Amino acid sequence: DVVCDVCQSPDGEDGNEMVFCDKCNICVHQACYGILKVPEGSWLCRTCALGVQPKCLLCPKKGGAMKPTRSGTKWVHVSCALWIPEVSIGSPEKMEPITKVSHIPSSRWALVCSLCNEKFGASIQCSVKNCRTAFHVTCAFDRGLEMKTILAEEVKFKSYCPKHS
Ligand SMILES: [Zn+2]
Ligand SMILES: [Zn+2]
Ligand SMILES: [Zn+2]
Ligand SMILES: [Zn+2]
Ligand SMILES: [Zn+2]
Helix, strand or coil: CCCCCCCCCCCCECCECEEEECCCCCEEEHHHHCCCCCCCCCECCHHHHHCCCCEECCCCCECCCEEECCCCCCEEEHHHHHHCCCCEEEECCCCEEEECHHHCCHHHHHCCCCCCCCCCCCCEECCCCCCCCEECHHHHHHHCCEEEEEECCCEEEEEECCCCC
């Protein structure tokens, strides 16, 4: 039916409802996109409100829930910012801005996404400890890899290559 673009979940919660953008028809949880209060009527995402189609600094995928850095001139996928370790979210409840992008190591910038083979952006790797297979977060989602947020002794983000999914 309908799924949240960030976490790929179809179910809402009390105080964490599914909200739809009036223009691009995208769907996001309150907690996933930083919506503090359910709107009284229609609602717009950030890029539709600004009227721009920015490219993600970290992956080659176009469209989807994106948030801006402190500058407001650069944009990053919420999923990419969540799943890439070195990236941090300025506000954990407003879900913005996307910061510490400069902290991504050169070794991560050097990884080639095994799914699209586009030497652009930043890729994460398989959660299995010896699996060096790398891929974009958005590519991992679109291709259909196992992408879970599990609760350990603490939320841990697990992304598994096709072989280990
Ligand atoms: Zn969500
Ligand atoms: Zn929109
Ligand atoms: Zn991205
Ligand atoms: Zn890719
Ligand atoms: Zn693997």
